[PDB]
Structures are given as C-alpha cells and as structure tokens.
Amino acid sequence: KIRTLQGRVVSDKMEKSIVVAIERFVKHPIYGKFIKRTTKLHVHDENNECGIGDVVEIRECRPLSKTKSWTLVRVVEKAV
Amino acid sequence: KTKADQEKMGLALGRLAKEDPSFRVWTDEESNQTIIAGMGELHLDIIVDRMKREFNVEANVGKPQVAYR
Amino acid sequence: ATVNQLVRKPRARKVAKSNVPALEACPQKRGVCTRVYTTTPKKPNSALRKVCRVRLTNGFEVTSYIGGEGHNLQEHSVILIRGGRVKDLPGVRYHTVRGALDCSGVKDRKQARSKYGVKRPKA
Amino acid sequence: SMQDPIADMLTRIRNGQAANKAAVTMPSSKLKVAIANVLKEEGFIEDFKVEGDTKPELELTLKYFQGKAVVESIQRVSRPGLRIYKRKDELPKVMAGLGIAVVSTSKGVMTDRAARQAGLGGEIICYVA
Amino acid sequence: ELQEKLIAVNRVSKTVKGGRIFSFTALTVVGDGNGRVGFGYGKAREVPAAIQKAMEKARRNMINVALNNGTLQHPVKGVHTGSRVFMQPASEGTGIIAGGAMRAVLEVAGVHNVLAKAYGSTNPINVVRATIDGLENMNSPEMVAAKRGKSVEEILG
Amino acid sequence: MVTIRLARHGAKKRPFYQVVVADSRNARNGRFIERVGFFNPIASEKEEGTRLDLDRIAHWVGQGATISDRVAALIKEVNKAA
Amino acid sequence: ARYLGPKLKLSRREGTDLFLKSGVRAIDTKCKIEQAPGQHGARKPRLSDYGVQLREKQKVRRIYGVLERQFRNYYKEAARLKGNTGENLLALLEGRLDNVVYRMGFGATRAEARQLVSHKAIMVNGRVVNIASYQVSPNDVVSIREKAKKQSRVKAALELAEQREKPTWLEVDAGKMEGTFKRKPERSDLSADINEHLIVELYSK
RNA sequence: CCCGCAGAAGAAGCACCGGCUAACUCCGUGCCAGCAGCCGCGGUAAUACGGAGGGUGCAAGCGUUAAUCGGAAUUACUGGGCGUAAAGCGCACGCAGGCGGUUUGUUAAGUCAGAUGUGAAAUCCCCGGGCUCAACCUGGGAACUGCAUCUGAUACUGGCAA
RNA sequence: UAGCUAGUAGGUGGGGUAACGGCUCACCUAGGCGACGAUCCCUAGCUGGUCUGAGAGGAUGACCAGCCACACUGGAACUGA
C-alpha cells in the first residue's frame, strides 16, 4: 500500500486544516519502559468536514503550507 | 621596568647579539644585572632606542656595580 | 528507583571537581611568584615549610610548595607550577617544579634527581 | 489494590514453600491456569483444581522432595511497571539451562526451551529457578 | 594433598583493668580439591598456635559441593552479612579469576575455571562464609532431575 | 562526469591502489561512488595483484563513465580473455 | 635493552639454574648458588602472593630475555587466539628464532645464540633473518649461512647440546647444521618446572 | 637491498626499596633539615629524612603532572538504599500523569517470526597474503546488535464493543 | 528559564520561486506552539568512530573519511550549469 497513519483530531478551531496527534508507544532507550510519546502534525485536509475526537487516516504529501504537509484520507469513528 | 620583561631582555638584546661584532653582553657577577659594551654614548643611546621601538623593552641605563673587597 | 520516576527525572551524573584549578586540565603553569615566606604545618608533625604565593598566568593567585632545600627565590621570579597536595600544609595545592625557570636546581643531590632537576654528575 | 495478579501467584507459591503448606490456593483466571499448566508439565506442582463457577478457586498442590522445598527461588520479570519483551535468540536460560523460564509467545505460553525450539519468542513472564 | 591455606591473620584486643591484652585470630581454608571444602576460624595469643587451632576446626567442618568438572554448575549468589559475592561458571575460563578470599577458597575447592566478583564489603571473614554457602546451594543436574522433570537430558537441554 | 580512477593507499615508498568509481570533482582518497577492484604495483610474487570487477566497469560504460589512463591500461594489462 | 649485566645473579634470585651461563664449565658450582643475590640475600622473606606471581613471571622472562613491553604483547597475542592462554603463551614463545636456535642446539646459551642470530648468519627457510623475535612458522626448516660457518662457536654448540637431552619436535642434521622444525610445541614437551596460571592471573590486572 | 674492509671497537640509563608493593644495611641528622598518592615518619639506635653500598622494577626510555574511564554495585537500566548509619514530605484531599480485577468477541498499535532495501569506505573482530620479523599496508568474510517498509501469529499489553 | 508568538497559525487571490511554501504583499479568519519542557540564558559543530568497560553504559568527536558553516567584521547583488 502506501504510508498512512492513524492519529486523533485535536485542534479544529481553524479552516481547511487540522492538527492531528499520533501516539507512539516507543521503548525508552535506557530504562525499558514504554512511554506514550505523542506527536502532533499540522495536516491539510479538504473543506471543513469533521470535529474533534475521531481517528483519521492521513498520508504524506506536498508541503501545502509552511507546516501542513500531510493529507487527510478519511474520517473514522464519529462520536459526541 | 619589571622582571616580566627580563626574558625578552636577554632575547631582544640577544637578537642584537647576532648583529653587531663590537657589541658584547655580560651578566653581573655581583648584582644579577646585564652589562652592555659598545663604542660610546651615542652608540648605546640608539641601541636602547633600537630595542624599544622594535621590541618593546624600555631599557633604563645606569652605572653597574663595584666589587668593594 | 520506581522506574517511571527515573523516566520523569533521570539519573543525575555525579560529576566531581578536580582539586587543581591552576588551569583547566593543564600539566604545568607559569607564575610570577610574589611573597615567598615560611609557614607552620598542623599538629601531628611540626616544621617550617617553605611556601611561595604565586599569581598564575590567568590571574588566579594561589600558593605552592618549594621542594628540596636551599631555594634562590625572591619577590618576583617567573617560575613553573605543577599540581599536588602538600597535605600537612593547609591550603597549599601545588608544587614548584625545580628544573624549570628562575627556581633553580637543588644544590647537589645524587639520589632521585629526576625530581628537583639536578643533572647527572660528570664522568 | 492488586495491580499484578501474576506476582500474587508466584509469591503465594514462594511463601507456600517457605511455610511448608501442602497446597496453596488463589482465584482463577485465563492466564492463571495457563502458567500453572507450564509448571504442571515441568513438575513443580503435583496437579491443580480449578473449582468454581463465579469466583473460580485455583488450588495448587505443592511439591517436596526432601526437607528442602522443590522451588528454590521463583522470580518475576514482566511486572506491570517495567514490561519486558525479548526475541527468539534473546530468550533467557534460567540457572544456565537448568531451571526454566515461563515465556508467552503468540502460540500460547510455554518454557524457554520449547519456545526457542519453536523458533519464536515473546514476553518473558517469570524466572522459575 | 588436602591443601590447607591461610587467608588472613590480624590482631585484636580486650583492654582489662591492667593494660590491653592482644590476641591473634586466624583464618584458614582447607579443601582436598575434589568438591569437599571447609573453613576454620580460631584465635589464640600466638600466631603458630592460632592457625593450628583454626586447622582443627577447618578439618572437622568439610562441606560437599560437588563441582561439575572443573567449573561451577550454574551462576550463584552468595550474600551473607554485607558480603555480596557473585560467581559465573566460565566454561573453560582457564584460571580462577577472583581476588583475595574468593580465589583461596576456590583454589582448594577443586575448580580451575569460574570467575568471581565480591560486591559490597570485602571483610575476609564474612566473604569466605559468602562463597561457601553459595557453593552449598549450587544444585546439580542430577539433583534437579531427582526433584523435577525426571528426564536428565531434557532438563539439561 | 563520473570517472574510474585510482586512489592511493598504503605507506611511504610502499604504495597501493584500489581502482574506484567516483565523481571526478571529488578528492583522490575521498568520497567515491563504489570501489571496483584493486591494484598493487609492488605486488611480490603471488598471483593476486589485481582483481578487477570487470562487469560493473562494463556496466558503468553504459552509464557514461570516463575510464582513466592507467585504469584502462590495467584492463589492457589484465586482458578480457583471462 | 637486551640484558647486558652480571649473568648468574638472576639465577641466584631464582634459586635454580635457568641454563643461562652453560658454556665450557658445564657444572654450575662456581656460582655460590641460591642463597646470595645480595648483601641481605642470605635470608628468606615471607614472600607474598604478589611476589610469587612476579618471580614466576620473572623466570619465564629471563630465560629468553624478553622485555616487559615485548612480553606483554605475547599475552595480548595468546589470549587473542584459540586454545588455552596458558598453553598459547609458551607456544608462541617457543616459535622465537633464538628459542628454535637453542632447541636445535645451534647455541649453548641464549646470549651466545642471539649473537649468531643478530649478526645474520642463519638462513631460515631460504632467507637470512637477523631479527630473533621472528616466528618460526610450523612445518618448516632452518639453515645456517655457509660463508660464515664453523668458527668454533658452532662446534662447541654441537658438542654440548648433544649431551643435553636431545629435543623432540625437531631434527638436527648434526653434520653441517640443517635444522628442521616440524610440529606444534605441546605443553607436555616442556621443561615443566615452570607454571602457567601464575602468569595469566597476573596479567588479568 | 646486497657485497667486502677495520675492530668489542663507536652506543645505558631513570625511578623505587615502612605497609599498600617487588627490594635492605651503615653513616650523618635530632619534631631541625626535609619526605609524602593515602596511612603517616623525624623528640639522639630512622630499612620511610639526606649520602654511600646493596637490591628490585622498567628500558632508549624512565618517572612527575594534567586528562578520561576503570576499580566505584560511592547515581546502582543490567546493578543501591530510606526505624537508629545520609535519606518518609507533619498529615490529608485531589487534576495531569503511571499502573490497573475478571469474560467473550474484534483490531494488530506495542510485541514476535520471516522476507526486502539499506546499515558509505575505513576502523574493531576471525581465517589468510605482502614488507627478513613486527608495527604497518592489505583479500574475503563476519560484523555494523540499528532503522524503515512489506506479509503474516493473536498469547500478553493497549484501543474499541458487550 | 512559566507562559510564549503578531507574517506570527491557516484560507483566498496577484506576484515571486529551478521547483514547494507567508516564500512576499493585499484582504479575510482568531488562531498556532507549551509540563512528552514552549520561550529564555549558558556551552557546543554533527556523524562514522577513538578511549575505557565483562557487558550495559561513561568520556570524547584530534588524525583519516561523509556532512554543515565561515573566509578581516557586517550587508547586498552580479555572473554563471
């Protein structure tokens, strides 16, 4: 297939853009305990679709903005 | 003027030791100072001035030392 | 312990300080050597040890010990300084290396002359 | 309040061997009866009963060979604060190939040697030494 | 042939109403070299009499440890009152890599292999206790087969 | 202009070379694309003095490489029939 | 940097003879042996464990005059290879040229032997070699230069060494000095008074 | 690199020697002169001070200082402690966060197995080759324990649903 | 060293760009980063690796090689692949 992430929608107080958060359960280098290492990405999407709290397939693309360089594929798990 | 220039005093006059045949250097057997030969007053008037404006050692000329047994 | 506390605040490396701040990892240092005098060591053993109060190259005025015996030191002498605790003397952390500059060699000492800088006798 | 139920299990056996109890009991679960199954084939218990319908009570019939108990010392490595996973080639040999090691691969839980002979590794759970 | 070996001898005191009287403690370790080792610790007022009294106590206190073929049988711990010796059975380590009071007890024990390291306090009395009780509990492959598994080869590997 | 040249290794008076494919602008012993074979000029009497990777040198020809002087001469010294 | 001193004084510091001054007087007797290394060597010390490791390290050193910097290299080399480091240390040390010169009997003492080797009079395997620390590789041969042959040092070495035990893993021509060296030096084929675990214990730290 | 000429001829020091640590006596000196990495020696019989003699270590170097890791499990991930030795906040409630009883189903994130690409060369390590040896140059291999992608396994941990 | 930022966070359109983009302006939206340590101060070129260590780590980044930055200090552009 192609490189695509899972993420979670965080900051949608703006237009045609979203800051997603993707969780990384990495292993600590020296202490061996798994830490919930967060990662936040300015991700471009199409016209204002979703809200907060929904897992969102997102793939790498052109640098559409200064920071936004990823594209939202689809919205999964709509909730309250 | 100080003892911090004494290493340059032996060096810059040692730099002048290579140049002139009739110009010797001695070190005081009685008072731990440098004795300088020459030709006359004017010959050693300019050599102090040769050492100052080239090698920064403001040399001060005085009468050496007597033995006095 | 309690590993996630070591995640939140890791192991502090216990860095030590070197006992000789003559200069920041340096073997020998050149000094001007003001005020040569004699002091008295502490209680378990008594004498009159010889001490110079030297201002180093990078400022940093400190003291140093004068090894051997019979030094021709004075009010101003460009000398060289190597570190070393002189334990019986409180607050003296350096040794003047004899064999260097204006602090000359020891008057004849045939044994252990690599320290005190005495040359080998001629033969 | 009872974070790790597996650490309770091995300590119940550990104190059971120290206090010389004939049989040590505890509540059952899925993983509980699986770890006791590995010790059953290895011969650290005699057998077990898993009696119960709502609060299933796993009882473990202990084992002795002399005045010294069978289980010399039994540890715990995959505790819930420092979860540890190892690969196939990096499986441990407890007491240098003498004792066993409970390790959970994806095809069930088994010993360290049975897992290494299977070619895959997983979560090293405890050290039965 | 039974390899008596003195370890450490040091003086002590009592301080009675007169002066203080000194005595001499003796630490020796004996072992024939085939898995039967034992230590002794006796004190008197004279050093040849001291190690003599410790030799009788070391001879009557031998311990069978069974030492599989020049090396130890598995890694052991031996902690005893501050002493914290660890031993890793180096397969043909070719030399007894251990310091004072670990080599000496293992030289006459019967091993030529295994390296050792004494953590914690290295007081000669408590560390010799620490190596011996560690060798007291080192189980044999025939021992664990008699109390577990029962198939000697598969329990070996 | 990727070339196939020589890079000098070894000590003083006892040289050694490994013929390497590199970008011609770069230094002699520096950044190279790929080592393909080696050459010894003081190759004392053992048969191994050169083991040239002939097929990639033939492959780099199609990619537009410029085979240097002695590198071409070593191919003429170690022929294409042996 | 060789040894260059009074010779048997090391043997009286080691008690026994390490065959360092064999020569014509093949009896040691004029040595005042084993209890006089100095003005106060007429007594005995308690001789600590560090000392008995060092004195044993000194004996294996002094038979072949190997300096410590050169000696430590062998320990780095022996532990590098396979087998036992106790066995490898002496095995690579037996391959020294003057060691095979002595074992073949071309030299009666190692100082007499190395004087032949350092003055390049030995054509081992087809090439004259003047460096005594040359490893005499297994399954080889060693010849002597004919144009410097038999100047009364070789014949006396031929006489005395044929009275001394006749070594094993090699063959001496004995007519015109054509030494052949065949196999690996075994631990059982040794002087055997030396120990080995005294050395490799000292070199761990 | 080789071949011949003359001749042992032209070439050995530096540190230490109370315990640690291999190696001792005599004389001078008297808490002085000084030694010293640590503990500590010297108050008139000093193996520790300086000078000889003797002896040990290392070697064209040998010590001194500086420097880093080791030893130091005296920052303890592997691998430490907290009643009296340094250290339980005076006690309590509680958000973030850490961890989390039991059962089934589901996902495969973590996890594990296999494959692929790459992990530049050198360096380091092993079996070899060439300078007389060696340092050194050098052949192939191993290694670079990683990382990313792809296809699977579903115990355990996590997410979701009951 | 607790808040920080104001072309600053994103849209639209013109222009710019070898090519992408606040890159650069116009107008709009009122957002973006932050306890997994933002902003600020001090120190430092990074890496393959070197040294030590049983290993894990600790210290370090000279010589050789890859990369980056600077060329008396500071700023700008030309030419040209």
CSV table of N, CA, C and O (backbone and C1' of nucleotides) in Angstrom, one decimal, chain E residues 82, chain H residues 80-88:
chain,number,residue,atom,x,y,z
E,82,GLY,N,26.6,-8.4,54.4
E,82,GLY,CA,27.4,-7.4,53.7
E,82,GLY,C,28.2,-7.9,52.6
E,82,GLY,O,28.4,-7.2,51.6
H,80,G,P,19.8,-2.8,42.2
H,80,G,O5',20.4,-2.2,43.5
H,80,G,C5',21.6,-2.6,44.1
H,80,G,C4',21.9,-1.8,45.3
H,80,G,C3',20.9,-1.6,46.4
H,80,G,O3',20.8,-2.7,47.3
H,80,G,C1',21.8,0.5,45.9
H,81,G,P,19.6,-2.9,48.3
H,81,G,O5',20.0,-1.7,49.4
H,81,G,C5',19.0,-1.2,50.3
H,81,G,C4',19.4,0.3,50.6
H,81,G,C3',18.3,1.0,51.5
H,81,G,O3',18.5,0.7,52.9
H,81,G,C1',19.1,2.4,49.7
H,82,C,P,17.2,0.3,53.7
H,82,C,O5',16.6,1.8,54.1
H,82,C,C5',17.3,2.7,54.9
H,82,C,C4',16.5,4.0,54.9
H,82,C,C3',15.1,4.0,55.2
H,82,C,O3',14.8,3.9,56.6
H,82,C,C1',15.4,5.4,53.3
H,83,G,P,13.6,2.9,57.1
H,83,G,O5',13.6,3.2,58.7
H,83,G,C5',12.9,4.4,59.2
H,83,G,C4',13.0,4.4,60.7
H,83,G,C3',14.4,4.6,61.2
H,83,G,O3',14.7,6.0,61.4
H,83,G,C1',13.4,2.7,62.2
H,84,U,P,16.2,6.6,60.9
H,84,U,O5',17.1,6.2,62.1
H,84,U,C5',17.0,6.8,63.4
H,84,U,C4',18.0,6.2,64.4
H,84,U,C3',19.5,6.3,63.9
H,84,U,O3',20.1,7.5,64.2
H,84,U,C1',18.9,4.1,64.7
H,85,A,P,20.5,8.5,63.0
H,85,A,O5',21.9,7.9,62.5
H,85,A,C5',22.0,6.6,61.9
H,85,A,C4',23.4,6.5,61.3
H,85,A,C3',23.5,7.2,59.9
H,85,A,O3',23.8,8.5,60.2
H,85,A,C1',24.5,5.0,59.8
H,86,A,P,22.9,9.7,59.6
H,86,A,O5',23.6,10.3,58.3
H,86,A,C5',23.6,11.7,58.0
H,86,A,C4',23.0,11.8,56.6
H,86,A,C3',21.5,11.5,56.5
H,86,A,O3',20.7,12.6,56.8
H,86,A,C1',22.7,10.5,54.7
H,87,A,P,19.3,12.4,57.6
H,87,A,O5',18.3,11.9,56.4
H,87,A,C5',17.9,12.8,55.4
H,87,A,C4',17.3,12.1,54.2
H,87,A,C3',16.0,11.3,54.6
H,87,A,O3',14.9,12.1,54.6
H,87,A,C1',17.5,9.9,53.4
H,88,G,P,13.8,12.1,55.7
H,88,G,O5',13.1,10.6,55.6
H,88,G,C5',12.1,10.2,56.5
H,88,G,C4',10.8,10.5,56.0
H,88,G,C3',9.6,10.0,56.8
H,88,G,O3',8.5,10.9,56.7
H,88,G,C1',9.4,9.1,54.7
